[PDB]
Amino acid sequence: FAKLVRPPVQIYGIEGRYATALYSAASKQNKLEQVEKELLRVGQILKEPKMAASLLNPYVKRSVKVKSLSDMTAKEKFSPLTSNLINLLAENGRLTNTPAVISAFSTMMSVHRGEVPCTVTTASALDEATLTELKTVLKSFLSKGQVLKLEVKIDPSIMGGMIVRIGEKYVDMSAKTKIQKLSRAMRE
């Protein structure tokens, strides 16, 4: 019944439980960046095609899976929480779904780093100078810790306007939407 260190971000799923556990594990010693780099590296280290094949090999023993995993983790000189977490996830068979947990923990550590979401879309993409200007425009809406991580986008499907997702805020100035409202009016 561990009062596991919930990262600034909370996740869900088996990936979510793993992410909370890893947030507790790293936050114990706060190795968020360190084990984070470790995990970024492991994302390919295990992505060794033969490694994935053996893990995906149903005719491969889960015990043997954990054994080869321990060999490869010592090969990475795995961090203690990281190594025993790798062992535990292999025991769960989470090796099948390990990358998702890695991504979730990444989101958790990024939000720990104040990962303010943002997504900039419009009738298209636009000027980079205008891009910085709109980033500043959102910044006043943005808050403390809110660091501009925007998702720029070009969308001619958007008849017009600008679809600005920011954290939770979704500012879709879309003149396609304006057109929809206008048609609604044109009926009446």
Place this chain on the structure above:
Amino acid sequence: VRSSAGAVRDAGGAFGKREQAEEERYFRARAKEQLAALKKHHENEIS
């Protein structure tokens, strides 16, 4: 569906109870008849 022969008697409710009881009454009448006839026949065979 179908209806059985003696379907009520098959069910045997109060109607079937009456069936049983009237069987008792009439068959007992006939039984006393057969028994008396047999007593008469025994009387006849006595001589």
Place this chain on the structure above:
Amino acid sequence: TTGRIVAVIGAVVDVQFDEGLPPILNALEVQGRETRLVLEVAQHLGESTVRTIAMDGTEGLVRGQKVLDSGAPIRIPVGPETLGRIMNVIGEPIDERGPIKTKQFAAIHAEAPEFVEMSVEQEILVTGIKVVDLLAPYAKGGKIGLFGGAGVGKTVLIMELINNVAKAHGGYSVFAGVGERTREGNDLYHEMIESGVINLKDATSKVALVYGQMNEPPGARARVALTGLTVAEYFRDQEGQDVLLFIDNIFRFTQAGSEVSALLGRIPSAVGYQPTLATDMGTMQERITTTKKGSITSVQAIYVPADDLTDPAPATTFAHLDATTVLSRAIAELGIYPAVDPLDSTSRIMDPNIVGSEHYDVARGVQKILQDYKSLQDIIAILGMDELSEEDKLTVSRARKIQRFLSQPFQVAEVFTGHLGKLVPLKETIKGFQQILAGEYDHLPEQAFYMVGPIEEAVAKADKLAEEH
């Protein structure tokens, strides 16, 4: 390998074995249990631990209990040599006599009779039974289903028929108390001791004891089907003797596989049974019978618990029952003893090409007459014998007499039925049938025909009544 207790609510257990899962029908013993606990590998789930059919009480086990992997079904000796004691399907002689070791020992999972190599004829296995001969004479080595209920005479008529035939089995024989009472087990032991067809100390065992009792859980109580099939195969070849087989009861047995299906998570049938519970039971019915080197005059009890005539269990029962023994528990309620469902049971030896034209025709006319009896019974219930027509009151008396002549009190029944058994002769039965067709007791009371043997014996009984009147 060797399985190790992993995680299970009881017998539904995948035991951690270092290598993979053994082949099908694998039954392995639990190393580290209180007794020899053989568990049957049954779920090819892989995982080096197969959810296995454990027939024993799982209590006391600790997770990690490393068990002895065998890899196949139980092997115990068979043949007429094992006759004389009472042994388990695992071979455990529960006759308090230690291993009654025989020669022919093998596993139980096997195939059915061949598509070209079995027996292809039917010989009326007559026993002189009043009702059975009267209408539904049996035949040699067929699938005869004993449609009776619980406490419904199935064991009572079973005692009568055992007394009748079992003392003189064609060869050796076998009897299974499949979910029979433990009290019935001890009583049947005393009865076999007093029966001689199988003798406890003496080697008069023309019979074989077997128990699948109700206090024995399904894991065994549901499992003895293959044991019986193998024993029948032995009597076909290994015991190699003209054998009738007793096995009771299968309702709780097929129901036992049903209860097992839940642990299997197997789909509930209409009665919640395993979806393939029928598959096995029909296949169970296909294993060992009359063949070229095969012969099983096995008696099959068709338990209709809860008197559910159309039970899905009764459905599968009728599905392969080459011979039908339809009890009329209503008749017994009417005091019938015999009490079968007359116009209901089917038997091939009741045919003009088989029973002869005379006997089959007589039986069919009897069925028609009884059908009229039922029909007009309600008709009377409306009116009564006041309107009893000449053809009708005659029909009424005749049908009452037929019902009376149908039953007989046996000597084993004479324990309760008082009247000792009457060894009904077939010709005597047909003769009484013809005489009743004539009306052999028109001036007499039919009550003499009730619980009676020969029709002449009934005439005597009626004269005795004339005395007692």
Place this chain on the structure above:
Amino acid sequence: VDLEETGRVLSIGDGIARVHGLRNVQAEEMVEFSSGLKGMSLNLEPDNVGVVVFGNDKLIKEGDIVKRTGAIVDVPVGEELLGRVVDALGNAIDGKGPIGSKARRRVGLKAPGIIPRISVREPMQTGIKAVDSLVPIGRGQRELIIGDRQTGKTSIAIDTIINQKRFNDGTDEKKKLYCIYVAIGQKRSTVAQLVKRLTDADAMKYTIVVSATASDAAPLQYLAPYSGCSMGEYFRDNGKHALIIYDDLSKQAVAYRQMSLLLRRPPGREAYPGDVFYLHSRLLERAAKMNDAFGGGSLTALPVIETQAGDVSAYIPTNVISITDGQIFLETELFYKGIRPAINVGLSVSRVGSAAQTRAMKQVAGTMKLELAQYREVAAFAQFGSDLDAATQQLLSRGVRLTELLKQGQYSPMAIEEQVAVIYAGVRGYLDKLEPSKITKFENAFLSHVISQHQALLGKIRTDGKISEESDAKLKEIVTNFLAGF
């Protein structure tokens, strides 16, 4: 590893075959396992395919690498099995060996369309009096057969076959036809008797063996509908009139039920899923005649219906009725009341139609059925019997005479024209004075008298198919001699 046309057993139990691999393998194919077990999968999971153990796969341990042979259900075609006992797996039935049938017809047989259908006109060889009388079966008909335990259903079938096998042994140019009838869910003793009698009744002369044993694989039970469909289509597209007998039918229903149940597919009512419509009608709707374009063959079908305590509302029966172009209601109590044939006649019905009805036999039945209904109309009154209205009494006697004639003989097919003649004599009122208990033996003896003497007039009517008033009178007089002289 293989992931296109070979899988590896992932996790199983009770033959629940879902293997890893053969993802690119085609759907609905009977392929060999790692134990070589030629078997079919349907439940193609995203990760695997649910494969049905085509029988018992005890020779297949877990992890087995099943090679998806890409082989769909293909079963032989051609009349080589007519008379030969074979099993659907290319095996024999009675151990009757190679029928001399070589080919195998893929499961890809569809039912005929309206154009591919042919108008049915064949008066069926029924060998049961009322069977041909009230309503025979058309060229490729579709009539249900409602029955219960040991109900004589197979016995009615034997009467039909005995009427059929003669021309199956015979050559009548319009009667040239193919025969195949299932003994599905059959005990070993039952099937042995079936083969032995087919020999004895000479039905093993022109009949292609169909049956599902009690030990028959549930997948085998399922394919048996398709098996019979392809087998019939063989001679049907070969222009030969063919016959199917889904006997039984409910067993394969429970079979596929257990199948999908293991598959964890949705149960449906009584655990019966929609395939009772889909899979079952998939073969059922083909009960027709292949067009002259489709060969001119006729695809008769004789499904067997188990009346589970008269489970009239069976979803099985439910689909059947909505599909039934005919049904066989049986008054089994009548057999229990001695009347075997136990005809549930007012209950019996047939929607196939009279385009296959002998206008002579049709003329006979037109009055016979009306009289039967009228008797049935007040047959309740017969109970009291007394003071019977003279019209009512006469209607009853006609019905009483028919009841005398109502019975039937097991494995005793007869000439249809013979029954036509008997009913004609009744229509003459020529049976009004025969005591019903003896009127049966009477009709039988008159039948013998004709089959000796009026056998000439019998063939005259038969080949004639036209009731010459003079030929009618000649038969009438032959019968009058036989009966007055009976």
Place this chain on the structure above:
Amino acid sequence: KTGTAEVSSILEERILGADTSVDLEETGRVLSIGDGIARVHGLRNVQAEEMVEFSSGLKGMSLNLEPDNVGVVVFGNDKLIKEGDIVKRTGAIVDVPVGEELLGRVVDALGNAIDGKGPIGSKARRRVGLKAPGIIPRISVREPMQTGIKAVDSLVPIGRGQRELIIGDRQTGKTSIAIDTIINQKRFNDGTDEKKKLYCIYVAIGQKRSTVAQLVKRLTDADAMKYTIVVSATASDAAPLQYLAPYSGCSMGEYFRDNGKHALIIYDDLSKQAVAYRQMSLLLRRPPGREAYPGDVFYLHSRLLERAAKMNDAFGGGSLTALPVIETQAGDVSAYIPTNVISITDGQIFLETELFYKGIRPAINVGLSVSRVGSAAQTRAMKQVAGTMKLELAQYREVAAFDAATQQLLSRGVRLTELLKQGQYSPMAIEEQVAVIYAGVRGYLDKLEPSKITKFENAFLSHVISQHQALLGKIRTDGKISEESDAKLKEIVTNFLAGFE
């Protein structure tokens, strides 16, 4: 399956390697605290069906088992349970103190008194894990048992070690039936024959506190409760509790009867046991069945019923007797409990609450009871009387709904059935029963109107006792067919009836 510890609750100590210290044999944290469905962190080395003791003293019955998580049973009202709680698994098959010090002491299955009569004085703790008797161990038993009601001993003779099954539904005097048996079982237990002196067992499942106190007042008033064991599973009896209460009776019967006690157990109703076990399985989310009830209740209830053995010479010579009483739903013979008992019982009793609806109190469902045991455990004198009485009552029933001679027969049989009746809570010795049996076999008042016979029967019992109480004890001790006592009975019958008018 839901990864129970896939949360950092254990996974944190897993990745941090901090979990190693957990007691992983017979203790630990709660792998799942919820609904009393207990999964324990570790204790995988615990025995199966073993005992679990929470750190809060609460008892746990671990039946289901994940690898270390489990399905254990909250033996109590756990409104105070906590997450990750510690259950020190006792690792034992359930046992509790046994001994006739309980006979006359009202404790629970675990030996827990509710009436304030003190701690369990019963001697030794017995694990209820009792299997079936052996073929050598078991043999035929036909000794009489305490019936004490006219028709009860008459047609369904009470066998010493016979397992009854008495069909009678809600408010059918089933409790009244048990009380009548006890009053009958009193004078037998109130006897010097240690075989007759029965330190026996009787219970009514779902006996709420009021029901319990009333039954206690009755049983102590009977003072046979002194030689009796009576536990009343009140309205809060736990599903494990009520569930193993029959198993408690099983262990207790092994104790006394297997030590040769000719003793009887009366537990009902196993239908409520089905409700409790199903409540568990629902909490267990286990696969349900008919009425959601498990189909394996067959072998589970067989563990009690199917082991029916009257202690033979190998089992001490006493009797491990049972007296089930069935309760129809709506005459629902095919009810899961009902069909099962039908599918289970080899012999069973049936009461006609419709005759109780007709007003008869008592009202046993004539014929509907089954005595395959037969008269072998009744007086051979009672056996002889019953030989006639069976046909007499049958004919009385056979044409009950009205020859004149047949009318005479029907009048006699109806009057006899009226005579056989008994009051409310009036069980006694079978001596006066056999007396009235001789009266009926002589038809000693068949001319007295049943309404006249209504009091004439009482007057007959009275004048016989005042006339032949000595001859009563004579026929009693002798048991056999006493022609001398028979003639004394004829005389005293002329006295009682003829002198009654």
